[PDB]
Structure formats: C-alpha cells, structure tokens
Design a protein around this ligand. Structure first.
Ligand SMILES: *[C@@H]1O[C@H](CO)[C@@H](O[C@@H]2O[C@H](CO)[C@@H](O[C@@H]3O[C@H](CO[C@H]4O[C@H](CO)[C@@H](O)[C@H](O)[C@@H]4O[C@@H]4O[C@H](CO)[C@@H](O)[C@H](O)[C@H]4NC(C)=O)[C@@H](O)[C@H](O)[C@@H]3O[C@@H]3OC[C@@H](O)[C@H](O)[C@H]3O)[C@H](O)[C@H]2NC(C)=O)[C@H](O[C@@H]2O[C@@H](C)[C@@H](O)[C@@H](O)[C@@H]2O)[C@H]1NC(C)=O
Ligand SMILES: *[C@@H]1O[C@H](CO)[C@@H](O[C@@H]2O[C@H](CO)[C@@H](O[C@@H]3O[C@H](CO)[C@@H](O)[C@H](O)[C@@H]3O[C@@H]3OC[C@@H](O)[C@H](O)[C@H]3O)[C@H](O)[C@H]2NC(C)=O)[C@H](O[C@@H]2O[C@@H](C)[C@@H](O)[C@@H](O)[C@@H]2O)[C@H]1NC(C)=O
Ligand SMILES: *[C@@H]1O[C@H](CO)[C@@H](O[C@@H]2O[C@H](CO)[C@@H](O[C@@H]3O[C@H](CO)[C@@H](O)[C@H](O)[C@@H]3O)[C@H](O)[C@H]2NC(C)=O)[C@H](O)[C@H]1NC(C)=O
Ligand SMILES: OC[C@@H]1[C@@H](O)[C@H](O)[C@@H](O)c2nc(CNc3ccccc3)cn21
Length: 602
C-alpha cells in the first residue's frame, strides 16, 4: 500500500493523521516518553518505541567531545529509532540556553539578564541564529530555550535566566525564537509550531507559567498572585511566543496559588491549548510530574494521571521509562485516561516532528560540525557581552576625572581578583556542567587574556589574584582592573537570601583600589549588595555573566566602544526591601531599572 505519512510532499496534518491511525498504544506512549541519553541503548529505544532523548546539564558522550562525536552519538540513537516498525525519528533535546553550552568549544553567549541590559532584540535574534547552527553542529535538533520567566525577586537562583523584571523587555527578547527556528511565513497562524528546516532547531518557551514569581524567589515554590497579575506580568511573553510559532512549551516546577503547574488543567489545557491555541507539544520539566506530590515521587501513578490529564504531551522522565510507560499503559487500559488524550499528545509531538522536517532529515549533517565555536559567532558574543555591560560609576566623585575609558598605553598596569582569570566564573551556570564550574573549562578569553590582547606592546601587565595593599601601593601601577563576584550556580543552588558576593571579593577591591585608581568589574547573575564595592571603586561595571568572549569587557574598558547597557532590573539598597520592582508603590532603588552611565569611543 501507498503510505501517506512517508510522503514528504504531503501536508503536515495529513501525514500526522495517517501515522497516528497506524500506531499501537505502545507506539503512542513511546512517543510521549523522553529519556536521558544516560539510560538509552539501541534495544531500549527500539523496544519501547521512544519518542525523544535529552542531555541534561553535563550529560555528554565524553569530556572534550568533538562536534563529530556528538553527531555520531545522536545518529546512533536515531538509527535505533528509525529501525522500529514505523520508523519514527526521535527528537534530541538539550539546554542550549546561552549558546550550545554543554559542548566543549561551543561559543558561550552572555546569560539572559545581560541580554536584557542590551535592549537589542535583533542582537538576541542573531544569537538565536548562531545558537541554532552550533546546536545543529552537534546533531541536536531541539533547544530548551528561551526561558521567558519574569524574575520578580533576585533571590531566585534563576534570576540570570530571566531577561528582566519588566515583562515588556522579556516580550521584546522573544526574538530569540525566530532566531532559533527561523522566521514564520506571512500566512502564519499564532500558536502553530514552526521550524524552517535542517539548519534550525525547535525552541521551547519555559517555564509555563510564573516561574519568576515565587515567594522570596524560592526556586520551584509557590507563586501567590491573582489571575489579573498572572496575566499582566507572567503570561504576556507566552502570547508573543505563540505569535512566533514556538514549537514547544515546558511546564514549570512551580505552583500558582498552591496548585502545581504540572497538574493544572485550567492553565495547560484551558488557557495554553484552548485560549492561546497552542498546537505544538507541551513537555514536563525533569521529574516534574514526580514533584507534583510531597514527598516527590511518593505516588507516581497519581503523578502520571494528574499530568497527562492536565494536558502535558511529552514527559521528561528522564530515567525510569519502564515504570512511566507501564503506569501510563495501565491507566489507558483501565479507562482512567481516555484514548483521546493520548491521541492529542501524539498528534502534537508528530506535528512538531513533521513540521520541522525530522522525517526528511533524521540524521546529522557532518558539514555542519565546523559551525561549532565559529569565529563569526564569537564576534557576535563579544558584541553582546560589550552591549550588556552597565556602567554604574565612573569617577570616585562627581568632580573626579572619568576613569573610563582607560589608556591602552601605560608603563605598568595591574589586573586582579578571583574573576579576572577564570573562564568558568565569567560564564556562570549551564556551562559545560549543569552548575557551571571553575577555571579553564572550555575555549574562551578571560578578562586578563583580553587585557593582554588589548594594550599597547609597551604596557606591562601584572596579574595578581589577591594582592595585598602594600603590593599595589608600591607596584608603580598606572591603574588596576579588578574583577570579582558570584560563583557559578544553577536552579536551587543559586537561591540566596543575603546576595553578598563571596570573599575574597570586597577585600581584594578594597586593597587594590586603596593603592591605585581602579575599575571594578562585577561578575554576577543579578544585582548584589554593592554599596561597599561602590565606595572603594573609582569606576564600577556590572558585567553580569558575559560568557566566553572576555574581549567584550575590554572593548568598553579601553574605549573601542562606548558603554550603552542599561539596568534590566532594579538594583536594591538592601535585601530586606525585596521584592521591589519598577511600578511598586514603595520604590526606593539604589539604581532604578533603566539606569546606566555612558562613555564615548576614543
Ligand atoms: C549567602 O547565601 C549563600 C547561598 O545560600 C551562601 O553561599 C553558599 O554557602 C554554602 C556554605 O554554607 C555553600 O555550601 C557549601 O559549599 C562547599 C563548596 O563551596 C565552594 O564550591 C562551590 C561549587 O562546588 C561554589 O559554589 C562555592 O561558592 C564555593 O566556591 C569556593 O569559594 C571559595 C571562597 O570564595 C573560593 O576561594 C574557592 O575558589 C571556590 N571554589 C570553587 C570550586 O569555585 C561544599 O564543600 C559544602 O559541602 C557546602 O555545599 C553544600 O552542602 C550542603 C548541601 O545541602 C548543599 O547542596 C551544598 O551546596 C554554597 O556552595 C554557597 N552557595 C553559593 C556560593 O552559590 C553564602 O555563603 C558565603 O559564601 C560561601 C562561598 C562561603 O564562603 C560561606 O562561608 C559564606 O558565608 C551566604 N553569605 C552570607 C553572608 O551568609
Ligand atoms: C556619546 O555617547 C552618547 C550616549 O551613548 C551617544 O548618544 C546616544 O546615541 C545612541 C545611538 O545613536 C542613541 O540611541 C538611539 O536612540 C534613538 C532614540 O531613542 C533610537 O531610535 C535608536 O534605536 C537608539 O536607541 C538604541 O537602540 C539600540 C538599543 O540597544 C539601545 O539600548 C538604544 O539606546 C542614544 O539615545 C543617544 N543618547 C543620547 C542621550 O543622546 C552619542 O552618539 C551620538 O549622538 C546620538 C544622538 C546619535 O546622533 C549618534 O549617531 C552620535 O554618534 C555618543 N557620541 C559620539 C559622537 O559618538
Ligand atoms: C515552598 O518552600 C517551602 C520551604 O522549603 C516548602 O515547605 C517545606 O516542605 C517540605 C516538604 O516539601 C518540608 O520538608 C520535609 O519535612 C518533613 C518533616 O515534617 C521530612 O520528613 C521531609 O524529609 C522534608 O524535610 C518542610 O518542612 C517545609 N518547610 C517549611 C518552612 O514549611 C513548601 O512546600 C514550598 N511550597 C511549594 C508550593 O513548593
Ligand atoms: O535539563 C533539563 C531541564 C531544564 O530544561 C529546565 O530548565 C530545568 O528546570 C531543569 N532542571 C533539571 C534537573 N532538575 C532535578 C530535579 C530533581 C532531581 C535532580 C535534578 C532538568 N531541567
């Protein structure tokens, strides 16, 4: 017989309907199952008809693996999936959230908070375009990005993953989506999924909804706000995402007024699917369904029932697939979950797969391997890092000479601080490892390396990680650049009620700035207690988490370009003010949202 779903010339909806009508319950539930590469084998993928795989943070084939190694791994998994009766290709997902960040040698872009500081949606679109290429360089077809959380309290460990506390800025930055996926056609229906083809990736608007609204910024906690507030702060960017054809949406671990997002039928089905007319697939977060219950995982049968009935389509299991499949099959066999619900979930998963061309190009393109870490992409990351920088102070007092820009020619200069020569620190979380890491973890340029690359050949550059006051005072330095701040963190590990930088940080700044005029570069995922740093410093720059391209920092420090970044968040006076956002009745910032000093290029 002619087999319609295998015919590339046929309309997506026709191909979807034709395939679905041929599938067994096992094949259907298989599609709904996403597993870690760590538990995947060819036999597992074939025998369970698995629909998707992912790499969680740090889930890599080998340390330092090449783009070709990634492609071969993904293709090996694909070969097993394509060998099933129906030959439905799997989709492979990864957190490419500031470049293809799990991958050695991948360009690492500034994290979202810094991108918000640029107020440049086209820049962010271009980052999406570069990121898609580097993801496809590794054979991967699906990025879990953008995070369109609106972080309302910087005590949250994921505040750096939010473009802004201002939903309007977050909405503007949804341009990442057509960068990753390609621009939607003129004739496009909001809520339909879209991916242009094999050189683009499926995107994921996350985490639905109100992940940035939790009490005290406690990660995965309760967002207590009325529907009006939910709809005017936390929801708007999802509509923009719909308009731009985002292929998938990931559900939040958080709760809204005490109801777990992973169990919320009203919002997932009633709003996202039925009101926004989202036609892509809805994916859980990692063990998200497990965490519906307290303790987590204490009634997995309930978890499966609650999440599938709420309207989730694909479950990021990610390990215990046999149990997931067994429980879901049982619920269907028992009449507890209707076939219509399974058919809806599979319709959505297949729609995204057919739409993106997965059935036509299930395997990697070896010619794309060379896209990884391309200099053109690094030049883009360098531009972004520079544009993200916010100048908070430039001259110890209002009558002082402006410190920045600094001269490239001077007899001797000092570069200092825990963050001056630490690539892992300047990248932050979601870089090589889930939580990020310390030291030379990938290919890049540290602040020290950037300084050495920028200055006149006659200028002697001295590095001291934590020099004492006497070393600085007696050193014969013209000026110092001192870089300090937060260590890398991700999710709950980043939750922080005090928001003061680790030591030595302030002590180093005080020692250096006490001995010579100094420019302090603050590396952080968020505003942190800054008055003491300000007091010691002649100039201070909030550099956020600028990524692999340290020359973005020096491009502004030495005046090749002027400072243009503006705060995308309120800078508080103290943590006891929190939460405190622009528009609040009590608004007493140290620096308001939108604050930023400027310089002109030399
Ligand atoms: C304000 O709140 C902050 C968050 O709540 C808090 O930071 C946390 O402090 C706790 C200690 O109570 C840390 O937990 C421990 O971490 C130890 C190792 O920590 C190092 O390595 C990790 C990465 O693995 C980094 O994230 C850390 O920053 C730290 O880095 C090291 O820091 C040194 C000092 O600056 C550097 O010289 C060094 O180079 C650097 N090394 C690296 C690799 O970067 C573990 O050994 C412990 O076992 C413990 O881990 C916890 O164990 C309990 C378990 O439940 C947790 O899951 C597990 O995390 C925690 O890492 C840290 N969180 C951060 C930084 O994100 C502030 O504490 C201050 O700063 C820290 C760095 C310490 O110096 C504290 O003494 C100090 O008080 C809070 N500040 C205030 C004012 O109270
Ligand atoms: C010395 O520095 C100052 C301060 O940075 C320069 O003036 C700024 O120039 C920017 C670029 O032209 C102006 O930004 C633009 O603003 C308009 C109107 O709002 C807007 O339509 C543009 O899109 C752009 O806004 C940016 O868009 C991209 C975003 O990423 C970014 O956040 C937005 O700012 C900016 O308003 C202006 N600031 C002020 C206070 O005047 C100045 O540049 C010189 O003057 C400006 C007015 C312009 O004629 C430039 O061509 C000119 O060089 C600079 N001086 C020199 C000589 O370099
Ligand atoms: C928002 O965060 C708070 C604070 O973490 C959460 O409350 C906490 O809930 C946990 C269980 O999820 C409690 O810990 C447990 O305690 C029992 C002993 O009674 C122990 O057997 C378990 O091993 C576990 O340690 C904890 O007591 C509780 N903390 C507080 C301060 O109430 C809350 O559930 C979160 N809300 C949401 C919606 O996620
Ligand atoms: O890495 C996959 C997802 C990621 O896309 C989400 O943005 C993020 O919320 C996320 N967190 C985890 C891991 N969470 C976890 C849960 C229970 C135990 C250990 C880790 C996985 N993921």
């Amino acid at each position: 017989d002619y087999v319609l779903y295998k015919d590339a010339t046929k309309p997506v909806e026709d191909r979807v309907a034709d395939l679905l009508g041929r599938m067994t319950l096992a094949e259907k539930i298989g599609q709904m199952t996403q597993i870690e590469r760590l538990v995947a084998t060819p036999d597992v993928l074939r025998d369970n008809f698995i629909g998707s795989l992912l790499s969680g943070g740090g889930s890599v084939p080998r340390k330092g693996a090449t783009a070709k190694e990634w492609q071969d791994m993904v293709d090996g998994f694909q070969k097993a999936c394509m060998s099933t009766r129906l030959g439905i290709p799997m989709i492979y997902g990864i957190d490419a959230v500031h470049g293809q960040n799990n991958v050695y040698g991948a360009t690492i872009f500034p994290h979202n908070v810094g991108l918000g500081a640029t107020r440049d949606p086209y820049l962010v679109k271009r980052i999406g375009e570069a990121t898609a290429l580097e993801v496809r360089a590794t054979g991967i077809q699906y990025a879990f990005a953008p995070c369109i959380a609106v972080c309302r309290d910087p005590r949250w460990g994921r505040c750096y993953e939010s473009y802004s506390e201002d939903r309007r800025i977050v909405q503007s930055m949804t341009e990442l989506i057509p960068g990753l996926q390609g621009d939607v056609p003129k004739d496009f229906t909001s809520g339909m999924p879209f991916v242009a083809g094999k050189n683009k990736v499926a995107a994921c608007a996350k985490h639905f909804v109100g992940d940035g609204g939790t009490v005290d910024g406690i990660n995965e906690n309760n967002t207590i706000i009325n529907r009006e507030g939910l709809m005017n702060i936390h929801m708007p960017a999802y509509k923009n995402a719909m308009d731009k054809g985002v292929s998938t949406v990931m559900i939040s671990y958080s709760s809204w007024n005490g109801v777990k997002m992973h169990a919320n039928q009203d919002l997932v089905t009633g709003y996202l699917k039925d009101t926004l007319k989202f036609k892509g697939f809805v994916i859980s977060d990692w063990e998200g369904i497990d965490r519906i219950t307290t303790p987590a995982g204490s009634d997995y049968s309930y978890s499966v029932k609650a999440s599938i009935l709420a309207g989730l389509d694909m479950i990021m299991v990610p390990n215990k697939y046999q149990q997931f499949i067994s429980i879901l099959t049982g619920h269907v066999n028992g009449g507890v979950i209707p076939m219509s619900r399974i058919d809806d979930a599979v319709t959505r998963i297949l729609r995204v797969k057919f739409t993106m061309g997965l059935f036509e190009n299930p395997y990697a393109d070896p010619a794309m391997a060379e896209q990884l870490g391309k200099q053109e992409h690094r030049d883009l990351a360098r531009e972004a890092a520079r544009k993200s920088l916010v100048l908070l102070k430039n001259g110890k007092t209002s009558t002082d000479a402006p410190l920045l820009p600094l001269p490239k020619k001077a007899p001797k200069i000092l570069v200092a601080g825990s963050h001056a020569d630490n690539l892992g620190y300047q990248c932050g979380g979601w870089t090589i490892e889930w939580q990020g890491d310390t030291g030379r973890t990938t290919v890049g340029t540290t602040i020290l390396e950037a300084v050495k690359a920028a200055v006149d050949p006659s200028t002697v550059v001295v590095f001291a990680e934590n020099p004492d006051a006497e070393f600085v005072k007696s050193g014969g330095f013209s000026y110092a650049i001192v870089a300090v701040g937060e260590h890398p963190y991700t999710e709950t590990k980043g939750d922080n009620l005090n928001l003061t930088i680790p030591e030595p940080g302030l002590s180093t700044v005080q020692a250096v700035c006490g001995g010579v005029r100094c420019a302090t570069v603050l590396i952080s995922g968020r505003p942190v207690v800054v008055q003491p740093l300000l007091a010691a410093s002649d100039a201070l720059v909030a550099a956020w988490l600028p990524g692999s391209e340290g020359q973005g920092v020096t491009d502004a420090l030495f005046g090749d370009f002027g400072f243009t970044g503006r705060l995308p968040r309120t800078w508080f006076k103290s943590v006891d003010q929190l939460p405190m956002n622009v528009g609040d009745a009590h608004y007493d910032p140290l620096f308001r949202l939108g604050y930023g000093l400027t310089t002109n290029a030399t």
